[PDB]
Task: structure prediction
Amino acid sequence: MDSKRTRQTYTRYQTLELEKEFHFNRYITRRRRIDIANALSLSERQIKIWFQNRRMKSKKDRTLDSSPEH
Result:
C-alpha cells in the first residue's frame, strides 16, 4: 500500500535507535544518516536537529569539570 513512515515525531523505540547511533557517531555520516532516516524512518532534517540538540541536552551535556553530573 502507500507508506512514508513519520517525517517528524518520535517514540521510545525511535529515540533508542537514534541514541545507539548517537553514541556511535555524534555527527553521523550523511550516508548513515540517510540510511537510518530511511530504515528507522525519521527525516534527515529531523535527525540533524535531534543530533544538533543532543550535544547540549542538559544531562548528556554538563560534565562539570569532567565530573559525572549524571
About this structure: The radius of gyration is 14 Å. The first helix runs from residue 12 to 22.
